């Protein structure tokens, strides 16, 4: 998956 | 309501060493706690809030991803009819998810959202309206989901338009608004192009503007700026 | 209770279902719920069960242990007071790890051992029950600790008693067992030369049947004789 | 801490 914050 | 009877400055205090324990679920139950007396949240406290909601959240959609990935397998031809069960323990951890993420957006109408004025605080809260209505459009389906995705779109948008008003473009809110935003566009949104093009030009700002930051700014901003890197990566 | 209406495959299934999606409060829920069945356990439904709940207070002990050590930290002298609050956070969480070590010990008294004659099964509740006892001494502090630790004893005694008389010295029970006793023995019962002593003769033993065991069997023995030897690294 | 099974 994607990088999220 | 069961931390009506705790001080506020103990639930603070708690949900610090609840992280210390990784205990995130207490976390979060401290900081739902810490909102409900009223009183705006500092940045710290902010954090702290999102910090805990964002480990409970991952974990169930992380649970839901291996159980929907054993679901749909249990639904190509060939496989064997193991009953009903898989779909009802999907939708137990799918129902629970949903829960915590109307408990976060709650949170956020009533009455976080309306007394946030800086847009440190404001930013901040409408990233994660978007994300928790993200969260909730991964595990939509029925006549609501195209509202969902809406309403995460909404809040992201307002975000972003009050972050590049009010912020640098190194601001790690605004960079990780962006991320997030970016990565609803190409998993969500069904837009790759539109997450691109904005985890390119995000990045390319604030490359622009780290001349700009003390050592301990750039490298708050810099980490930021890897993720966003990692995901064009991933992309292109 | 809440389990009494879904059928005990079902809760067998889900159990595995949540062990893939790594939620062990789940599992642990379901593995009671097929316990309180009435039913006996297989073998590999008592590994479920074991799994399920080594997992759930695992994580309630590591936490326990952050939080005491910020406690005995806190007052030490130098240290400035800083209120109840981590003391009645350690005791929130020694309230629910008492709290499942209780349910445990509940199903195994009703009415798990005294339905287990063969020595796979009555070994392995004895042990569990050994353990149980054992995480609950790790926290006790009252009139009732030595009758903890005692209770903790003569459980692992009966089950090493037995596991002596009907297993070979290479079941991986038996060598999980003297495993677990030794660990009792130079944790919590101030008795390291008996832990050693017995994680010796339990390797020693254990080697010298090796030879009769299949690839299979032996590669389940050895990894268990290696844990008695690690601790024995540990503490010579 | 030590080993346990
Ligand atoms: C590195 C990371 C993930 O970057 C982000 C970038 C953008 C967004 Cl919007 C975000 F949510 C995170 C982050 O956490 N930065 C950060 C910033 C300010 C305060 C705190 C903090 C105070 S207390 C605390 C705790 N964990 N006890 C953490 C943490
Ligand atoms: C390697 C380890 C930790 O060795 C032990 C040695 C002694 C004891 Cl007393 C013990 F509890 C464990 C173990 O788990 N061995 C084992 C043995 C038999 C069956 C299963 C099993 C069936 S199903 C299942 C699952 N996780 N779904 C696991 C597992
Ligand atoms: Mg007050
Ligand atoms: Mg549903
Ligand atoms: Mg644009
Ligand atoms: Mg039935
Ligand atoms: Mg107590
Ligand atoms: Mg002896």
């Known amino acids: 998956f994607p990088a999220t914050v | ?236």
């Open chain 2, 1 to 236: 309501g069961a931390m009506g009877s705790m001080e506020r400055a103990s639930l603070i205090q708690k949900a610090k060493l609840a992280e210390q324990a990784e205990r995130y679920e207490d976390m979060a139950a401290f900081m739902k706690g810490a909102v409900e007396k009223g009183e705006e949240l500092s940045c710290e406290e902010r954090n702290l809030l999102s910090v805990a909601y964002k480990n409970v959240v991952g974990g169930q959609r992380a649970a839901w991803r291996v159980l929907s990935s054993i679901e749909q397998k249990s639904n190509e031809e060939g496989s064997e009819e193991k009953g009903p069960e898989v779909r009802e323990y999907r939708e137990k951890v799918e129902t629970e998810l949903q829960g915590v993420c109307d408990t976060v957006l709650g949170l956020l109408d009533s009455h976080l959202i309306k007394e946030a004025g800086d847009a440190e605080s404001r930013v901040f809260y409408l990233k994660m309206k978007g994300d928790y209505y993200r969260y909730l459009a991964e595990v939509a389906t029925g006549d609501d989901k195209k509202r969902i995705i809406d309403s995460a779109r909404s809040a992201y948008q307002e975000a972003m338009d009050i972050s590049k008003k009010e912020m640098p473009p190194t601001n790690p809110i605004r960079l990780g608004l962006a991320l997030n935003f970016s990565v609803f566009h190409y998993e969500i949104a069904n837009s790759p192009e539109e997450a691109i093009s904005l985890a390119k030009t995000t990045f390319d700002e604030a490359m622009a503007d780290l001349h700009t930051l003390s050592e301990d700014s750039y490298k708050d901003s810099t980490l930021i700026m890897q993720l966003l890197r990692d995901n064009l990566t991933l992309w292109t």
